[PDB]
Amino acid sequence: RQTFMANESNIERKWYVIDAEGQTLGRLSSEVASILRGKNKVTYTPHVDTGDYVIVINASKIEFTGNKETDKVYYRHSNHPGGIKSITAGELRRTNPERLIENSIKGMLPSTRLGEKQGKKLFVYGGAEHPHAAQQPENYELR
Amino acid sequence: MFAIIETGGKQIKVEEGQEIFVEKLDVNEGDTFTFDKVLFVGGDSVKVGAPTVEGATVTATVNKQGRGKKITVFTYKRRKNSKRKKGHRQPYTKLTIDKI
Amino acid sequence: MEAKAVARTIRIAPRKVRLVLDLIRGKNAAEAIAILKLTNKASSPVIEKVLMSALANAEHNYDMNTDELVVKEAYANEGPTLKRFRPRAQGRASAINKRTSHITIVVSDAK
Amino acid sequence: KLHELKPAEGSRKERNRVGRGVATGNGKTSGRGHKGQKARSGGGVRPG
Amino acid sequence: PRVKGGTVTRARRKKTIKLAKGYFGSKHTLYKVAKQQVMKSGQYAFRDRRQRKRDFRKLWITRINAAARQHEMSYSRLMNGLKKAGIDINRKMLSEIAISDEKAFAQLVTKAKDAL
Amino acid sequence: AVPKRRTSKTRKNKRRTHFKISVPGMTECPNCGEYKLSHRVCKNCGSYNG
RNA sequence: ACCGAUAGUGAACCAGUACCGUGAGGGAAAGGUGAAAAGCACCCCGGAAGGGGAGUGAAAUAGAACCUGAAACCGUGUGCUUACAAGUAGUCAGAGCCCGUUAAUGGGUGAUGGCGUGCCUUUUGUAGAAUGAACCGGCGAGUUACGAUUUGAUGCAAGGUU
RNA sequence: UAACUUGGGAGUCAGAACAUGGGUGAUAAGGUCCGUGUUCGAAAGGGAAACAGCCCAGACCACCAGCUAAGGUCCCAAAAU
RNA sequence: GACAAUGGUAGGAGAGCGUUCUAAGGGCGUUGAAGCAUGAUCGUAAGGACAUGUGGAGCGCUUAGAAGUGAGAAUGCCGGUG
Distance in angstroms (rounded) separating the CA atoms of residues C109 and C54? 13
CB contact under 8 A, E96 and A2: yes
Distance in angstroms (rounded) separating the CA atoms of residues C5 and B96? 66
Cis preceding-peptide flag for C45 (omega within 30 of 0): no
CB contact under 8 A, C34 and F35: yes
For residue F37, give the chain C residue with the closest CA: C38
Q: Are B12 and B20 in contact (CB under 8 A)?
A: yes
Q: Are C73 and C27 in contact (CB under 8 A)?
A: no
Strand H bases contacted by the protein (CB, 7 Å): 10-13, 42-43, 45, 59-67, 73-81
Distance in angstroms (rounded) separating the CA atoms of residues E93 and E101? 12
Q: CA–C1' distance A115–H49 (Å)? A: 21
Count of CB atoms situated within 10 Å of the CB of A67? 8
Nearest CA to CA, how far is D22 from chain B (Å)?
7
* Residue A118 amino acid letter: Q
Distance in angstroms (rounded) separating the CA atoms of residues C34 and F36? 8
Domain count for chain F: 1
Distance in angstroms (rounded) separating the CA atoms of residues A41 and A39? 6
Breaks (C-N over 2.5 A) in chain B follow: none
Q: Are B62 and B93 in contact (CB under 8 A)?
A: yes
CB burial of residue C86 (10 Å; 0-12, 13-18, 19+): exposed
Distance in angstroms (rounded) separating the CA atoms of residues A65 and A54? 25
**How do strand B3-6 and strand B38-41 relate by DSSP bridges?**
antiparallel
Q: Is F40 left (phi over 0), alpha (psi -120 to 50) or beta?
A: beta
**What part of F 1-50 touches E (C-beta under 8 Å)?**
8-10
User: What is the rounded radius of gyration, in angstroms, for the C-alpha atoms of chain A?
Assistant: 17
CB-based contacts of C23: which residues, under 8 Å, 6+ apart? Answer: C35, C39, F21, F23
Q: Are B90 and B67 in contact (CB under 8 A)?
A: yes
Distance in angstroms (rounded) separating the CA atoms of residues A52 and A31? 13
Q: Are E53 and E90 in contact (CB under 8 A)?
A: no
| Sign of the CA dihedral with A133 first, then A138, A139, and A140 last | negative
Every domain of chain A and the residues it spans:
1-143
Distance in angstroms (rounded) separating the CA atoms of residues C66 and C30? 9
Packed helices E31-68 and E9-19: angle between N→C axes, nearest 10 degrees: 30
Count of CB atoms situated within 10 Å of the CB of C5? 19
CB burial of residue A126 (10 Å; 0-12, 13-18, 19+): middle
Please, how many CA atoms are within 13 Å of residue B76, restricted to the half-sphere of its CB? 18
Reduced to 3 states (helix: H, G, I; strand: E, B; else coil), residue E58 is: helix
Q: How far is CA B86 from CA B25, B76, C7, E14, E16, in A?
A: 25, 12, 56, 20, 16
Count of CB atoms situated within 10 Å of the CB of B72? 14
Distance in angstroms (rounded) separating the CA atoms of residues A110 and A114? 8
Distance in angstroms (rounded) separating the CA atoms of residues A29 and A24? 9
Residue E82 φ then ψ, to 5°: -65, -20
Every domain of chain E and the residues it spans:
1-116
Q: Are A123 and A15 in contact (CB under 8 A)?
A: no
Distance in angstroms (rounded) separating the CA atoms of residues C78 and C12? 11
Q: Are E67 and E104 in contact (CB under 8 A)?
A: no
Nearest CA to CA, how far is E104 from chain B (Å)?
7
Q: Are C2 and C70 in contact (CB under 8 A)?
A: no
Nearest CA to CA, how far is B81 from chain D (Å)?
7
In DSSP notation, D1-48 reads -TTS----TTS--PPP-SSS-STTS-SSS-SS-SSSGGGSSS------
Please, how many CA atoms are within 13 Å of residue A12, restricted to the half-sphere of its CB? 2
Q: CA–C1' distance D28–G144 (Å)? A: 24
Strand I bases contacted by the protein (CB, 7 Å): 8-16, 18-21, 23-25, 35-39, 42-48, 62-72, 81-82
Q: In whole angstroms, what separates CA E102 from the centre of its chain?
A: 26
CB burial of residue C103 (10 Å; 0-12, 13-18, 19+): buried
Nearest CA to CA, how far is D40 from chain B (Å)?
21
Q: In whole angstroms, what separates CA A36 from the centre of its chain?
A: 8
Task: Choose the mutation target among C37, C39, C43, C44 for the interface with F, i.e. most F CBs under 10 Å.
Answer: C37
Q: CA–C1' distance E6–G32 (Å)? A: 20
H or E element, residue E100: helix E91-100
**What part of E 16-35 touches F (C-beta under 8 Å)?**
25
Reduced to 3 states (helix: H, G, I; strand: E, B; else coil), residue A122 is: strand
DSSP strands (E only) in chain A: 15-19, 53-57, 73-77, 84-88, 122-124, 138-139
Q: Are A70 and A87 in contact (CB under 8 A)?
A: no
Distance in angstroms (rounded) separating the CA atoms of residues C94 and C91? 10
CB-based contacts of E113: which residues, under 8 Å, 6+ apart? Answer: E71, E73, E81
**How do strand C82-87 and strand A122-124 relate by DSSP bridges?**
unpaired
* 3-state DSSP percent of chain B in helix, strand and coil, to 5: 0, 55, 45
Q: Are D38 and D31 in contact (CB under 8 A)?
A: no
Q: How far is CA F5 from CA B54, F2, F8, in A?
A: 73, 9, 9
Distance in angstroms (rounded) separating the CA atoms of residues B22 and D27? 45
Chain F neighbors (3+ CB pairs < 8 Å): C, E
Which residues of E are less than 8 Å from B49 in CB distance?
A: 111
H or E element, residue E54: helix E31-68
Distance in angstroms (rounded) separating the CA atoms of residues C21 and C41? 11
The reply to whether the CB atom of residue D46 sits less than 7 A from any atom in nucleic acid chain I is: no
Task: Choose the mutation target among A42, A140, A143 for the interface with E, i.e. most E CBs under 10 Å.
Answer: A42
Which residues of F are less than 8 Å from C42 in CB distance?
A: none
In 3D, which of B48, B36, B40 has the Cα closest to residue B2? B40
D–F contact (≥3 CB pairs within 8 Å)?
no
Architecture of domain C1-111: Alpha-Beta Complex (3.90)
Q: Are A25 and A60 in contact (CB under 8 A)?
A: no
Q: Are C12 and C43 in contact (CB under 8 A)?
A: yes
CB-based contacts of A53: which residues, under 8 Å, 6+ apart? Answer: A13, A14, A15, A16, A121, A123, A135, A137
- Give the resolution in Å: 3.1
Q: In whole angstroms, what separates CA C4 from the centre of its chain?
A: 12
- Looking at F1-50, list the stretches that DSSP marks H as alpha helix, in order from N- to C-terminal side: 9-15
Strand G bases contacted by the protein (CB, 7 Å): 1-5, 7, 43-46, 48-53, 65, 70-77, 84-86, 88-96, 104-106, 108-115, 118-123, 126-127, 134-143, 152-154
